[PDB]
Amino acid sequence: LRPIATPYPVKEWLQPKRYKAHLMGTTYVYDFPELFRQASSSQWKNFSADVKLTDDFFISNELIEDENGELTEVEREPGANAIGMVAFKITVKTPEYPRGRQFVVVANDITFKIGSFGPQEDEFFNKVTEYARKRGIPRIYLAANSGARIGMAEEIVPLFQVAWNDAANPDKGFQYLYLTSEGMETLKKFDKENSVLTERTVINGEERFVIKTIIGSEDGLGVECLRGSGLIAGATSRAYHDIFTITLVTCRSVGIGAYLVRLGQRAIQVEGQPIILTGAPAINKMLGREVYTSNLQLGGTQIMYNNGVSHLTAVDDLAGVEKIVEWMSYVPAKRNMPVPILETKDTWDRPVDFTPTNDETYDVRWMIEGRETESGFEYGLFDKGSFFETLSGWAKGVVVGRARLGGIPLGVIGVETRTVENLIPADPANPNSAETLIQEPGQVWHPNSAFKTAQAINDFNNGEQLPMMILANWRGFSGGQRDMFNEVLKYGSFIVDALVDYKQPIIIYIPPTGELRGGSWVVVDPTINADQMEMYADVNARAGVLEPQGMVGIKFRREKLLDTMNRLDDKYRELLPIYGQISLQFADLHDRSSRMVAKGVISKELEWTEARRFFFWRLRRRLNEEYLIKRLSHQVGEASRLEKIARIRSWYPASVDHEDDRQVATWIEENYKTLDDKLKGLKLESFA
Amino acid sequence: LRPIATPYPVKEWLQPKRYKAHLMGTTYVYDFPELFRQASSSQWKNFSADVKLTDDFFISNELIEDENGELTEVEREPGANAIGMVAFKITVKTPEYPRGRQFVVVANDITFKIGSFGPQEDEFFNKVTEYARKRGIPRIYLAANSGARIGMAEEIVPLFQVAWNDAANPDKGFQYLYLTSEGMETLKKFDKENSVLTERTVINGEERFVIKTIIGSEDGLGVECLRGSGLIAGATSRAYHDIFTITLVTCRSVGIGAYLVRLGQRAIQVEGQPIILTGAPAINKMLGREVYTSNLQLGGTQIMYNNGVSHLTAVDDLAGVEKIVEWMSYVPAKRNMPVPILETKDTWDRPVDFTPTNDETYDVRWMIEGRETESGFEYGLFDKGSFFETLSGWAKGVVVGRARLGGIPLGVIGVETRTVENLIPADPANPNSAETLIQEPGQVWHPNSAFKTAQAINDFNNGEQLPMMILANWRGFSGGQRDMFNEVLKYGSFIVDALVDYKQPIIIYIPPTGELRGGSWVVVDPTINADQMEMYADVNARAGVLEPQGMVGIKFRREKLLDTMNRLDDKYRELLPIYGQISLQFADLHDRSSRMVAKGVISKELEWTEARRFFFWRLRRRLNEEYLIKRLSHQVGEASRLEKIARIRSWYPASVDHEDDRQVATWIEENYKTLDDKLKGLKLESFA
Ligand SMILES: CC/C(=N\OC/C=C/Cl)C1=C(O)C[C@H](C2CCOCC2)CC1=O
């Protein structure tokens, strides 16, 4: 029976599966929508304390297969699921979508056959994924599983005979397994003749049916589970390019489960819940020794968070759900809808306060989100409280997250200026290899941080469909033996490929005290994707092929130095020190934003304190023009980007200055319908 | 003067740039087309010794910018190039294209400003790339360079003054650099007022013009070289997805040069010619010690071939050119043309001879290309002499190359069954880290071999546009700490993504003695890309979620064993050994190709000796049906794959068996024009 005198019903007794989930250290699958209700109520409170929510602000409807295999909504008692995979359609009013947004949640039921994936779970997971893709809606996956289902044909276990070499002495081997005439009958009786493929023989007067293959009557034993897993692996690969995908790992995720985490890309790992290919015991078998003590050694957050497989960790399920909900607050309600604007108290119209200084170490997050000080808050570039960092466990040379600029959500990449101390632990499989410490100097792309940069760019583009700002401040790629060996060329090239593919406005901005040198400029140059990319440089930024020291070593050598002493020391070599300094200054004078403007390689030089104002209206004006470019592209007879943007601009009143971001933005927003009428009349002119 | 009494003119004297190239250990750029003439003549001789070639079998025309910047053909004397980048259009009759195929070669001129990339070289390289892309033609790049051009404004060097803190003692610092009234005049005289940005001041009665920024009059100093490099980086990124791209590294390739090698992907590195980001001296500066002795330590073949950055090494320029020419013999003449069929003496109609054996180590290349023995040649699956292995320096657990099947070119991936001993050398930058040996057991995907597999799939798809066969034989992904830490989940997921993107027929075939277990099946399951993928299993292959040993450990435990002794030992525990064997055999009986067929997860089970015949006609029939599917897709009102293939099949005569590959192929080829007439009549029915 139950725990006896509680004021309200014992949930874990009414539905013992709920208690089974709790014993495995996870939330019961039918209790997840309530976690999402809690997390969404909280985001309302964080946004506007006085807002009054009805219960119909949050709706969760279970999705199941109908009689024709099609997904429909039902309301049923928890634990009625006849398969180990479950889904809900969620309709929720949020700050960014006060009239409602929708997404699907799919989840393993760790209580149903240990949350294993059989062909039915695979087909359902694939239908849910397709259901989301068709509607353009996000797909959240809650991973709590033991991977592919495995089995043998249990009905053949008590039936099979051995054909011994010597009936007297078994120990000397056997020739095959077979069924008797009675075995074949038990199978016919139970309508399971298919379970084996046999070949009739006769030895010593009576019939043997040699087992050539065991098939089994139960679905879900072997290769049919492999097929089902490939199906959902490919389904998820495609989903990532199509809709917002994210996964929360909540008890463990095994095999196909672990790949699904990676294939959906965006992953949050609850502390102590491993992401693994196989368990430690199974691996230890093979290896012949007790090499590993736990699954957490193979797939704990100290592996996957440190890897970049897990974008975030969470202390518990609810924290994980809060993170999902916060991550989606930057993301359009569905594919191709505009990005969700959310103005808060920190409005566009203010200077930027926190400012880095040449001789003084800073955390780049201060420039991004601002900084708390003894004398008050110093505001950064982006809206106060809006910075949501991800991939924070991995390749800490770069910092990536979401933020809002006067309400406009965007992806943000910045450069960590402090040296990173990367601790690689020993693998207990190498009798004694040791812990190794990697030093990663600031403002240098290593293979890991190059990969992270490309990954961020892809993750902003693909489901999030965000504009992006990169606060570019790299002194170059590392060219030393180890990093070259570890394929820095490949990871650096991933960045160019990610930019080519980018579909929303991009701003590259070299910040004050910052620099962009050589290859590190190249990889981010706006001619990579001129349709989307624009570059800016602070008046206190630097750029050129080399730093002054490197430049002097090639083009201001001792000959040229002495010639220059010869030219303005009347006496003319304890002059070297100061004369070197002079050559260094001579080089630095080429590296200024004024030269960048003169050569036409940046859109504008800017002042940091005015950047927030400038970028807000530049972005807002770009979002508006992009929108019109796309409307124009949906006509019948199509053209270049140059032709489209020129024609849209020809619709602006003659007096409007095409260069005035605010003016252009304000006039478009006053005139959307009028521009729409103009588009309608062009379609009625595109049969020819 | 010259070396004096030679029978013919001294080329290196008539054009001293030719000698300059030779001194730098490379072929002179205008002598490369002659290398391609040599290599193409040789491929004719290797193919058919008695074929008689005219000189018009090979044509090389230089491409240059005309007066309006457009590329045209000219004939001029070598060394007339006014920029350091050169290109040729090549028209060549080859065995696969006896009437001619074309491609462009672009190359740095290592003799022109040390082969550095300035804005003019970048714009030209970008025009050549676009010229090739427009025509769909391959783009070959010959890399011999020193990276981006660097400079200072030399005209300001003899003109600038220092504003000392104390005119008597320089050693105590300065305040700025400035020009006199006479400096400003020299600049006005030479029409170079733009070279500096100045601010007029007056100190002690006469005018100082403070240098605020040095611009310089010479193009090619700083950020304009960065812009030009980004342009060509993005141009090359796009080319790889569009046309066949390959690069040969011939003296050195530096900076943007090294990235261009990676971005074009397919790379052949001449021995002793480094691929680097910076030189050892420049790196040694920074580090404060003499850490590196040569560029070859940073970017020699022992780094880049071992990395997979270099797909092949070559002993000299000519060997490199032979490899390019051989690599392109598998590749369509231009984008979207059919793959080039080249039947040789080894015709489709024969059994496969070399056969692996369960207890006996083999080289998988024997199954692919066949094997020379004491008693004669044992033929493999593919045409004798047709196997062209690539990425052979890296991740040797997988083997990738091109081959031909009865004349049909295709990409091939196989599994190296022998343990690989991977030697990672120490980096001389870590005071004493040591050489480390990695053991890579056969038939296991590690991060490196997973990456290599995905890379191969991409490289077959993108410019080569090849069908592919994978001889799938993996026992699983490695799930140990080190490989999990090193992100095996990410690389394994690259494979699924590559397959989703694949545009030509794929065959997956588990060979005899081979197996596909768990995750390793999943990643290659045809439901990943059902439009293109088909799976087959040899009658002597195995597959399931786990190997028998692993399966027994979970589902045939001691309880079940003893129950089974209890069932057929009359006496009923020195029976364990044989009874374990019995359970192992019980598991193995589930893992057979007969179960695969019963569950519907493979197209067919096959016999190895008959595979070449079977796959030849299956592929040939797929190439034909694909062709028709595409013709049908180019009509006005479009539909699913199911609908298209069904309609094409409805055109076959009623008596044709849709399942007979040879019959279907033979009837389509007899009827291309008749099918074309049928397509014409459907267009004249697709206005509605
Ligand atoms: C400016 C392009 C670039 N790399 O782009 C990497 C490409 C990323 Cl797509 C690059 C160079 O070409 C040569 C530069 C140095 C000049 C003087 O000799 C030492 C080398 C260093 C440098 O960083």
Ligand SMILES: CC/C(=N\OC/C=C/Cl)C1=C(O)C[C@H](C2CCOCC2)CC1=O
């Ligand atoms: C069959 C899918 C798969 N991985 O696919 C990786 C996914 C690639 Cl895209 C996979 C599993 O799910 C669980 C398997 C074991 C079953 C018993 O407990 C130990 C684990 C091992 C395995 O290999």
